[PDB]
């Protein structure tokens, strides 16, 4: 019961600040429109950056130093990767402590080292391929050796990150599918580049191998009945979770590949999930606007909330290096959380 | 009495927009600095566009599509004219629809044809002079068929616009003064360019003829025992108003060229004035932060208001083609003025 007094005071008067950012000051001086977007929002691996992309084409980055983004520089960007095109998806290098990988729905990958000093993002590298080409997801192997760049259909990459990104290998998406006009919904990494797990839209999930830097289809198991939304994985290792359309949410174990637990609360579709970094409690974001979060050993819900349709598509994610969660606010405006006097559920 | 409900209902509590550009937003998000400046502001002819520039260097423009700037498009550009150097005055060509003349304080005066598909202003054409004649005020005919450049001393030049700019003719300014140490102040063209009227430092005013390109000193009278600061023409051409730093504003007729009626209530030095196109009313900015709306037929006051101390340098425009004004707001924000349901006064 530590847990649900925990999340009930971070969700308290105070212990909240808003994240100010443009979208935010621009509401504060049109309300004291029309909400653009958050295309995608990522933090750095240990935990001191987070990065993020509106609709606008104009990608954020903060240098987290303070809890309330008071002492917080901010490199404000605008619309990169050309001027008509804007950022999809973006992975954080965890190689090194700047690098950034940025994909436009186009046939050109964006390799950006961001500066801390100036506000300058100063374009390191452009990467290219077959013209008809395009790639909207990139994803970076967790000990930074592997880069995957995924299309909507028809054609997967994998890069190696050592040897300067010389392009290892494809793969066609129609070999792993084998199915009718399947488009690949959400990817994700296993812990230490060894496997991906793919999401397609009929229902299927599929597990490759990348070990050598050969791809190859392992398994395909049929786990729902539309469209995988998202896919997370525990950072203990030993279950992966896995949220669909159809309104279920399972963790599956990761020894023997069988469900082994589900939630059954839910009514409605979901539309993204998010697990603390100690694999303690899970944060279900569905579609009827409502926030849940449940408990990951037991099952059972242990605390609710509701957006009250304010900024329909709302985005949750936990630090990688403590138990405080960014939330979506009222108009497109993102709500820090914390509890300013601990750190980790530990201390508490 | 009609004309004094028009203007107290236009400083009502509707019936006011602020225009959104970026210093409005900028103070927005820094609210909720050093002002710059606005160093000029002028329509186009046919009272759908307009056009300043701040100190900064960047110069915007709009094309008034709607009352309160709704769907009014803005193109925002960069510090044009140079990087160092910053724009101080321009004229809007009534020739065509989209040419803009720019001079920026040197020996270069750039024309520009700014489109309103894309956000670009293209420069078309830059003009130049001797290498150390500094211009830095130019006009247009209100018919389109001249076009003057002036400097702080020694040099007056006029083009003729029809014929792609050939230089027509110039004049040193110590053979229109023939006083110690002159500088023209505010210059301005009477209602279709037959002469131009200008105004020195000393006091003095001078009425030049432009009839065919050659000009010529027609004749001076001793106006004002201080610095002119503006000369405003009445759109029916009975009489052209003359406002000076000495703290006087007479209005002279024009077909004999002797004072007719004085503006007593004064008490101060004048900034700026301008008068309404149906020639009616009168607006006079002094200097003490405090505007004034007098009535030109008879010569009474008939409304004042108060700055308050916001935007110390303050500017007024009342438009070409309808009855209202714009006016600064608080910190160099531009602050519209309507009454929603009057297009001009008559149908008052």
Same mark, same amino acid.
């Given at each position: 019961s530590v847990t649900s007094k925990y999340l009930q005071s971070t969700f308290s008067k105070g212990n909240t600040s808003h994240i100010e950012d443009k979208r935010f000051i621009h509401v504060s001086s049109r309300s004291h429109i029309t909400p653009n977007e958050i295309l995608s929002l990522k933090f750095h691996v240990s935990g001191s950056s987070m990065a993020y992309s509106r609709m606008d084409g104009s990608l954020t980055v903060w240098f987290i130093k303070d809890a309330s983004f008071d002492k917080s520089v901010e490199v404000y960007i605008p619309?990169?990767?050309?001027?008509d095109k804007l950022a999809t998806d973006l992975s954080w290098?965890?190689?090194?402590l700047n690098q950034i990988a940025v994909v436009s729905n186009s046939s050109e990958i964006s390799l950006l080292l961001i500066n801390e000093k100036s506000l300058t993002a100063s374009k390191l590298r452009t990467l290219s391929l077959g013209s008809k080409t395009k790639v909207n997801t990139c994803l970076y192997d967790p000990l930074g050796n592997w880069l995957l760049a995924a299309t909507k259909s028809e054609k997967i990459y994998l890069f190696?990150?050592?040897?300067?990104?010389?392009?290892v290998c494809s793969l066609n998406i129609s070999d792993i599918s084998q199915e009718d006009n399947d488009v690949v919904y959400s990817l994700a990494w296993s812990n230490g580049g060894s496997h991906i797990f793919i999401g397609f839209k009929s229902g299927y999930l599929a597990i490759l191998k990348a070990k050598h830097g050969i791809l190859e289809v392992c398994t395909k198991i049929k786990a729902h009945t539309g469209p995988i939304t998202e896919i997370k994985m525990d950072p203990w290792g030993r279950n992966f979770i896995t949220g669909s359309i159809d309104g279920n949410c399972y963790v599956w174990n990761m020894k023997s590949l069988c469900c082994e637990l589900i939630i059954n609360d839910l009514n409605s579709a979901v539309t993204t999930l998010d697990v603390c970094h100690l694999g303690k409690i899970l944060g279900i974001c569905t579609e009827d606007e409502m926030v849940y979060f449940y408990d990951l @050993?037991?099952? @059972?819900?242990l605390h609710s909330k509701s957006?009250? @349709?304010?900024?329909t598509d709302p985005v949750l994610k936990f630090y990688p290096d403590k138990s405080w969660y960014i939330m979506s606010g009222k108009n497109d405006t993102l709500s820090n959380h914390f509890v300013k006097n601990e750190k980790n559920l530990i201390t508490y």
């Open positions: 619309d990169c990767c050309g001027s290098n965890p190689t090194s190696d990150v050592k040897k300067d990104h010389s392009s @050993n037991s099952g @059972n819900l957006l009250a @349709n304010y900024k």
